[PDB]
Hints:
By secondary structure, this protein is of the alpha+beta class. The chain contains five helices and nine strands; from the N terminus they run βαββααβααβββββ. It binds one RNA strand through residues 1-3, 8-9, 11-12, 23, 25, 146, 152-154, 157-161, 167, 169-178, 184, 186-195. It holds the Pfam family KH_2.
Amino acid sequence: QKVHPNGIRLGIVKEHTSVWYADRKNYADYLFADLKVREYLQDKLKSASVSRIDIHRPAQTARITIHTARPGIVIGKKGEDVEKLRQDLTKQMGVPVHINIEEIRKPELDAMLVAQSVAQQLERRVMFRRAMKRAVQNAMRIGAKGIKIQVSGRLGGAEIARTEWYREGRVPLHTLRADIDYATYEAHTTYGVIGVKVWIFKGEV
RNA sequence: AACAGAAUAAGCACCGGCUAACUUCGUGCCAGCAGCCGCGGUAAUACGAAGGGUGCAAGCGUUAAUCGGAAUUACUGGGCGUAAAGCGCGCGUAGGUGGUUCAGCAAGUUGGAUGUGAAAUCCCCGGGCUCAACCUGGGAACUGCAUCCAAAACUACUGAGCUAGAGUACGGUAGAGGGUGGUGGAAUUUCCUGUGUAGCGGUGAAAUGCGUAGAUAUAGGAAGGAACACCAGUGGCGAAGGCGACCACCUGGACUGAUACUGACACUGAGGUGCGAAAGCGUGGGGAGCAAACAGGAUUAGAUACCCUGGUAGUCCACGCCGUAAACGAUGUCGACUAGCCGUUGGGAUCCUUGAGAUCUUAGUGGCGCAGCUAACGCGAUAAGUCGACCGCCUGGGGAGUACGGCCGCAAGGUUAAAACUCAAAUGAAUUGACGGGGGCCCGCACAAGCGGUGGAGCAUGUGGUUUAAUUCGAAGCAACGCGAAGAACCUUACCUGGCCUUGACAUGCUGAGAACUUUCCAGAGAUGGAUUGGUGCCUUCGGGAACUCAGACACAGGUGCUGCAUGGCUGUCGUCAGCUCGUGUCGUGAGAUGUUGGGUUAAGUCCCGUAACGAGCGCAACCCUUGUCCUUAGUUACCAGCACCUCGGGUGGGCACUCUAAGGAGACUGCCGGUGACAAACCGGAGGAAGGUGGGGAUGACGUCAAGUCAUCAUGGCCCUUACGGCCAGGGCUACACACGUGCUACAAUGGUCGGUACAAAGGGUUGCCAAGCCGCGAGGUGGAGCUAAUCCCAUAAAACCGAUCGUAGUCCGGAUCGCAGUCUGCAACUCGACUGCGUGAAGUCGGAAUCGCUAGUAAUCGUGAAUCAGAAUGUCACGGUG
Length: 205
């Protein structure tokens, strides 16, 4: 059922989030670094929303480009968090670490940034649909050509597992030529676990 | 009037919907609640409490009892085609209603006057008690009944007329309208007679039956009984039931024309009177076929039934009875108005006349249709439309058209016709689905063609069952059982038996202690306990800090414990099936519907032509990968055509032709030819071409379904354990074992079996590894250490095929299970419990029931090779090639 919309297009649309060659004797000693970096960084940067954390390995050290749509929260008073983490990313990843920060201008057209706001609204006890009818039209005044948002879970009920489904525009999924974003962020309410899926469709080719 | 002092004085029901007003806590299909809907199975806004809140107040609630709401007994104010409801049809008494002109009358009717309709009560305007209830003055009202006066439209009564309703007299047609006799022809059966000789008859198929004691067939004859082909029709006639041979005989009514007469003589009809299909009943006839009851055969778990062979009352006639039917147009009779068109019976017209004529008009009988009505379906001059006159009948479902009583009947029975009790529903028309042993088109190894297996035997593997101290859980039709598990000697591992811990194996905070480290030691199955040379760091505001390790105490830690029906995540399934929806618009009272149907076509909701719909999305197609052709760029470790070289090995120099490798491109679009279609999609052929009509394969599975599976991968709501349901360590266990089922491998031999030679692959792994040459071993191997970080080195010898030999179809020079003995390898350790090797022994098995599965071409069938997991261990899983 609906094979993951990145794993079919690694190639014709998108590329990896981490590029580095490794021998067969060190391949599984760089993965375990790069997988507990991403669990570390998102638990620290719970605010100052983060979409993508890329990692390059040049000759013998590192490079990391953390993407936020609000860089001023992370770079606060000239890198009081930047040099503080750069001391302490080396303690998990023994090479010296670079940290680079870009902007995510138009923050309402990347799926991770959108779906983090859905968990925020649905844990403030906002209505399950008034939160989302406004979170699609706002992401259609500027930008995209199609948006699907599925909201599944407890949805407040007693024994209820309904799925909200609202769509606008055009979203293909069996065209490999197209360009689709995808993100699943969850939510822990005072009862039940709500999972949210987002299918922002940018332009094709 | 004075004194005292805020002192002397607030409950009751309810809070899920109707219905104003809400959340926590107990409880868990228990107790309990309730005016109806109905709540309660472990999170209850409905039960019990607690806060809060709403209604009313000196009262608030329940029960009982009437009228409202109830247009639910409908006078004002309902109904009867299908929801309950039109008698089976006539005739007719009492009664109800009355066409049209005058004239009279005044019984109804209207207007007025008088007498009355007790007072109170109700209503209106006032007046008294500090207000109000309460008391009270004046008026209206009491709808009525009676007596007088007047008016005269309508009804009644009376008197006279009129002909439009109704009836009579006269021509004239059409008819299965009745009753009483008579007479036919075809066919069936029984009987007689001739010829002739082996079956007839029956049915999914048979059997009972009938036959040489001469059947069926076939010809001749006789007797008898009932029905009346073709004409024959939405056709006729009758009050309805009903009525079909031809003729005579009596006999009723309808149509149509002309003309005179009577002058309202009419309509309906409670009671009462008649005619009442068929089955049945009584007495007498009559007995061809058909046929309940019955008998036998068959089918059948069973078959009184369907089907088969027989067969009686009855059906037929006369006379008498019974009175019901889906007695149907599910529609009482009678009268008047309201657009059309196409039929048909019979009858007059007019009309040019030859008509296969024309138009108009009545009496019937059919098909469509506008207004209109209808819940809808549907009726629509033969109303269910608009209106009149009289009658019958209906009041939720069962109980029940039933019981008692009455009247009729020879009998069966019929007609008239209740109640108690019990339920919150019974029923109507129309929608979307689902389903059919209903119909129409289409597609799939779905059948049919073909090859090969499963179930027979042996071993391998899983589940059920059994058993044990534990055989740790989970997955139960296809969708399950070589399944999580891509590896159980211990470890894994959860379970069992013990040994052993309590802030803990681990997290953070607190208090002390020492750097960490190294201790090379004993006890003990180990866990652990105690020795134990040593070590004394590290940054120093030199104060210490941080680092680690030990103890104390608190919050806690931890959980493979329950819930997959509290859920997220991730996968199966229908199904790679061709569908699934929306916007705006119009139709419908509404749930809906249309687009998305029709014709053609397609692997396809793919296209074309059509069309109250016009569009859009998801899907299909393409975009991606791989294989097949060629071109360009590229030449080491790959490559050898040309060149020498050679020791004859691309060995070497060399070459960039090639094969190969991998980058980037072209090629295929029904493009072109012909035919075919509406010439429009497309379809059938044809050329060229490496490839021809989506070239072959792969990934890609729509809206959804099954509360499908998983809390034991992980994440989480709740619930329990927290001196153990948590931790630690030994051995055991999951591999036990009369049995049954699932997949899988070998075999059962001569398209074979051995021995000796000899030929050709792809794909992949390897510096914590591959482990060569030499070397020693019957053999698995042991030495030995190269080469190697990979087109180089190693894994690494492909097997079937071919060639020669023997083997002669024998449970075997077949088959290899079992088992004895002897070895090597990994690992601390091969007892329960590993894999291989040697030697010996040699089983079942001679192609395998009912059944049942896979496959349409490099495919089935058969032969090998590699990888993942991995110290060791594949008949499985995944993957690549031979022969075909």
